[PDB]
Design a protein around this ligand. Sequence first.
Ligand SMILES: *[C@@H]1O[C@H](CO)[C@H](O)[C@H](O)[C@H]1O
Ligand SMILES: *[C@H]1O[C@H](CO)[C@H](O)[C@H](O)[C@H]1O
Ligand SMILES: *[C@H]1O[C@H](CO)[C@H](O)[C@H](O)[C@H]1O
Ligand SMILES: *[C@H]1O[C@H](CO)[C@H](O)[C@H](O)[C@H]1O
Ligand SMILES: *[C@H]1O[C@H](CO)[C@H](O)[C@H](O)[C@H]1O
Ligand SMILES: *[C@H]1O[C@H](CO)[C@H](O)[C@H](O)[C@H]1O
Ligand SMILES: *[C@H]1O[C@H](CO)[C@H](O)[C@H](O)[C@H]1O
Lengths: 34, 146
Amino acid sequence: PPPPPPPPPPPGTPDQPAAPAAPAAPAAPAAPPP
Amino acid sequence: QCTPCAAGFYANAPDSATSCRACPRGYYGPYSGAYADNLGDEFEGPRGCYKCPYDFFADRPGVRQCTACPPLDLGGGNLVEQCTEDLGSQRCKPCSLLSKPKTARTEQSPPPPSPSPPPPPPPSPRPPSPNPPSPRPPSPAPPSPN
Ligand SMILES: *[C@@H]1O[C@H](CO)[C@H](O)[C@H](O)[C@H]1O
Ligand SMILES: *[C@H]1O[C@H](CO)[C@H](O)[C@H](O)[C@H]1O
Ligand SMILES: *[C@H]1O[C@H](CO)[C@H](O)[C@H](O)[C@H]1O
Ligand SMILES: *[C@H]1O[C@H](CO)[C@H](O)[C@H](O)[C@H]1O
Ligand SMILES: *[C@H]1O[C@H](CO)[C@H](O)[C@H](O)[C@H]1O
Ligand SMILES: *[C@H]1O[C@H](CO)[C@H](O)[C@H](O)[C@H]1O
Ligand SMILES: *[C@H]1O[C@H](CO)[C@H](O)[C@H](O)[C@H]1O
């Protein structure tokens, strides 16, 4: 009798963790003069 | 099997890493397969996430490259260039108002990038093919007469 067949591959590997957003844009607009 | 850390990520060990991690805000990882040895800066390696240069900035943790400071536009015809106070920062401030200027930056600029690896060789020549069945011998003549 002939030999058996081969296996199938694994899937597609995972994606890197989606990065977070950015800062809250600025802090103090314009502190009061003296 | 082992998987190489993707771009913008570094392995938290020189040899047997357990999980890739994202580079910090002030750094950037250009290569694939960055690893972070523990000799000096924690988030730094020979191929690891480098800190952004003096002029360039980046804020996203996992990024391939930084970007230059944008030209600030306060209104009509006011394009004022911006720089950074320290070596690696995620915010670009006006170059006029920074305290320590280009004059006092005594850091020495790191070397160029070492060259790129050679290609993969061709597929090796298969061993020769098996010679055919050798021929047969002569055949026994019919018994001589009596
Ligand atoms: C000769 O042998 C090689 C194996 O190395 C190969 O099967 C060829 O197809 C055959 O002709
Ligand atoms: C190396 O040179 C750059 C200019 O590209 C800059 O002066 C840095 O301060 C220095 O480290
Ligand atoms: C690879 O070469 C560059 C210069 O091309 C640099 O010296 C690196 O330190 C080296 O590893
Ligand atoms: C291959 O490697 C070097 C770095 O070693 C560089 O990124 C080249 O651009 C690349 O072709
Ligand atoms: C097939 O290719 C390899 C390349 O690594 C080897 O040099 C020989 O050319 C042959 O085994
Ligand atoms: C005799 O010659 C060869 C062997 O010597 C072969 O078997 C032939 O079939 C037979 O006739
Ligand atoms: C009978 O046949 C054999 C075959 O070899 C032999 O030639 C004798 O001489 C013949 O008489």
